[PDB]
Design a protein around this ligand. Structure first.
Ligand SMILES: Nc1nc2c(ncn2[C@@H]2O[C@H](COP(=O)(O)OP(=O)(O)O)[C@@H](O)[C@H]2O)c(=O)[nH]1
Ligand SMILES: Nc1nc2c(ncn2[C@@H]2O[C@H](COP(=O)(O)OP(=O)(O)O)[C@@H](O)[C@H]2O)c(=O)[nH]1
Lengths: 369, 44, 110, 369
């Protein structure tokens, strides 16, 4: 199985280019895309080596980089121009899909704040038209900005099969808190570490989690509640890493309860004490879970790249993510009373109201029906 | 004549299928089948 | 099943075959499929000697009830396994095969 | 069994003159027609050493070259003048035929684009009259030009028992892509590489393919589908070479499926992983064939000349060759609506339409009847 990545807008190209640099250095791949002498299954993200990227001014600075051998602002303006080059960009994808052995999914890296955001919303719909059996995971990044943000939300709630949220307000606070930057090329260092760590169990094979659906099938309970948040602690026993991930200071998100948790421990930790820690974390009751259906916490180990110590990443599904949509929602209404049909905004405003209504009702003892 | 060419077909094709039936039943003697048919033909 | 990467591809290729009843199943066909999996997955970068012993066996219904790997071992190394470890691994391999198809079913439904 | 070759027109002379130069060096033969001291069967093309060639103002360019001791624009002008010297050039071919032990074929090198078109059309007709048991292979080269081109195709579809296409357009790309020329003196260097490596199995005897009729009857299943295209990768295992031959970037051609493939591996590669690569090519499905008849792929090894590293050539019988005809067929009707019987052109027009239909019928699961 293989996973084709797409990079849209200024953000997608930058965080994708930094994702590939980190992923090339994590492996034994020279900047000239040639394997150096110096186990890690790399057929999923690299093609025999060529990355399976589809990039869409910034391209020139990439081509002037040492990695050249590795390959307006409205939403309506970003939607229309994609329609006029509909056939163009798909030929690149159609040859890469059929040239691929057995396609699995489509990773999308884009910022929803505007030509790239508009182009993304267009492409997300067409992929549902052509390929019905391919997952679409989107590494969206949150910030007329309220308008564009909610429109793409209308597509991300019914088209994208999964979604991992990364908001700049939580990342910028971290850079000033634990990095003391006072830049885009600086916070992207953290975004690259989370992205590279997200697909760790795919490149280093283990007994479990050898496919992208294996990670997603546990967290997302119903096709509607497909939003996730992240947590990265080291900015050492396994009990220490678990307790530091469940603190609010580390999450990348600005009653409520958890639906499912996945922990990625990438160190050389002792794999015999991992089952012990899950016995004791349950006793302190550090996290509150859904009352309707059963839920648990998941811990998965891996191996760090020797060519480059314990780290940790936590993928969670918390209903407190509903607050982020509320801010965009409330920000939209204030502009709607202040200034060919303007009916698409009405439908998008309505459908996101149902998503928020699902979350607040997802925390009740009778979410069934 | 025209009734003899088709007579060889039903006779030769039947004899060939007896071969791949016995060449397959074993524990290379198996890679020979991949040499006889390559287009999935003779899949009967 | 400690490899995971290889057993994933091996469960995708045996799907069209094992759904049929066992009467139409013959061992000489599956070996070409197993050999294909060892070539595609990461198990290709491996010692050629140990790959010479890894084969298939047919237990004696449906194709998901008579398939199992064997990894026969003879010679001096056979004094560590002694025909009882090979009668115990297969006793284990069933429980790891069932708990592996009961999962790839539930990720197909999802 | 000896093969007497013919060269017509400026093209046939230039490719043949550079074909012999590639052969004279590949053997220990000085340009003075004298063997150099410095196992290879050399009795097919050379007569004890003199090449068996019958050429027909470029001739003076050869007589001044150091190899001197080795021997209008209308299609009607070519067919007319060829009738005036019917006895002259047939005196030479006949005296060269009986002097040979047992004639086998007539490898004829001509371009269908001035006098080589009309004269070659005359020869291929006259050979089938007197010599009814002699194969006639032709290394025709593809470029009023639409007229002279298709008229030769009328004869090349019912007289020539084989045909190897080499279009200057696709060659010019490879001249530009991987050689960066912008010239005839350069593209012919690639043509001479294809012609010489085509008969490498005749001059170096191996297990099979010790006669021209062995290379012909394997690929060409029926007397009509007798057009072949070539593929030459070196411009490392057998899997590295086999994968590159099937890429459309290497074929010298500008649904669809193959009919028969023959691979020529001129390396010193061990013959134990050969079957392994063929086994792999079947698995990944890098090429498809006809559904009606059993079509298989054949690979042949040989030995490089020690007097001169792995290479590779592929003889292909692909249905996509029908595209080159349509380009000729199309431009003809346009010239037919733009301007003693003018019936030969229309009669030739009909038979080319019968051929193209036969190709597009070859890709049908019911090509029989
Ligand atoms: N997280 C993150 N966001 C970025 C980065 N660069 C740009 N962005 C976002 O992208 C938005 C600007 O989009 P822009 O590039 O003007 O869109 P375009 O002009 O259509 O390509 C801003 O609101 C940022 O939040 C980055 O390096 N990291
Ligand atoms: N590939 C190749 N084709 C050539 C070369 N020289 C000539 N041709 C082809 O031959 C055609 C011209 O034929 P021409 O010399 O006029 O025939 P003539 O009237 O008998 O002399 C052109 O369309 C070219 O495509 C060569 O060196 N290489």
């Amino acid at each position: 199985r293989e996973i084709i990545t797409l990079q849209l807008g200024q953000c997608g190209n930058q965080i994708g280019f930094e994702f590939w640099k980190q992923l090339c250095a994590e492996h034994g791949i020279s900047p000239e895309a040639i394997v150096e002498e110096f186990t890690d299954r790399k057929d999923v993200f690299f093609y025999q080596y060529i990355p399976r990227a589809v990039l869409l001014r910034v391209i020139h600075s990439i081509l002037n980089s040492p990695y050249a051998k590795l390959y307006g602002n409205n939403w309506a303006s970003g939607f229309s121009q994609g329609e006029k080059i509909h056939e163009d960009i798909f030929d690149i994808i159609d040859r890469e899909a059929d040239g691929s052995d057995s396609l699995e999914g489509f990773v999308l890296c884009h910022s929803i704040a505007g030509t790239g955001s508009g182009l993304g919303s267009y492409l997300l719909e067409r992929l549902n038209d052509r390929y019905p059996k391919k997952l679409v995971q989107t590494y969206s990044v949150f910030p007329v900005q309220p308008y564009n943000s909610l429109l793409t939300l209308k597509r991300l709630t019914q088209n994208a099969d999964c979604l991992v949220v990364l908001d700049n307000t939580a990342l910028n606070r971290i850079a000033t808190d634990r990095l003391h930057i006072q830049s885009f090329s600086q916070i992207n260092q953290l975004v690259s570490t989370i992205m590279s760590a997200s697909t760790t169990t795919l490149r280093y094979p283990g007994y479990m989690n050898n496919d992208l659906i294996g990670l997603i099938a546990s967290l997302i309970p119903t096709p509607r509640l497909h939003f996730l948040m992240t947590g990265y602690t080291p900015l050492t026993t396994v009990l220490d890493v678990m307790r530091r991930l469940l603190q609010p200071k580390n999450v990348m998100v600005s009653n409520h309860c958890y639906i499912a948790i996945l922990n990625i421990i990438q160190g050389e930790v002792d794999p015999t004490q991992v089952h012990k820690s899950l016995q004791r974390i349950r006793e302190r009751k550090l996290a509150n879970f859904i009352p309707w259906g059963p839920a648990s916490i998941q811990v998965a180990l891996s191996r760090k790249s020797p060519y480059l110590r314990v780290s940790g990443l936590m993928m969670a599904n918390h209903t407190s993510i509903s607050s982020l949509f509320e801010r965009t929602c409330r920000q939209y209404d204030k502009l709607r009373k202040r200034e060919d049909n303007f009916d698409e905004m009405d439908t998008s405003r309505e459908i996101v109201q149902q998503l928020i209504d699902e979350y607040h009702a997802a925390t009740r003892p009778d979410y069934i029906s | 004549f025209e009734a003899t060419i088709n007579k060889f077909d039903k006779n030769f094709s039947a004899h060939l299928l007896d071969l791949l039936a016995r060449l397959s039943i074993y524990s290379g003697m198996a890679s020979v089948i991949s040499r006889l048919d390559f287009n999935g033909f003779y899949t009967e | 099943l400690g490899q995971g990467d290889f057993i994933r591809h091996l469960m995708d290729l045996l799907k069209p075959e094992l759904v049929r009843p066992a009467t139409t199943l013959y061992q000489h066909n599956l070996t070409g499929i197993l050999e294909t999996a060892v070539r595609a997955t990461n198990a290709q970068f491996d010692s050629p000697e140990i790959l010479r012993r890894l084969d298939v066996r047919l237990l004696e219904d449906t194709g998901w009830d008579v398939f199992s790997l064997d990894y026969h071992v003879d010679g001096p190394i056979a004094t560590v396994f002694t025909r009882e470890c090979m009668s115990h691994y297969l006793r284990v391999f069933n429980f790891l095969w069932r708990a592996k198809r009961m999962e790839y079913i539930l990720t197909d439904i999802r």
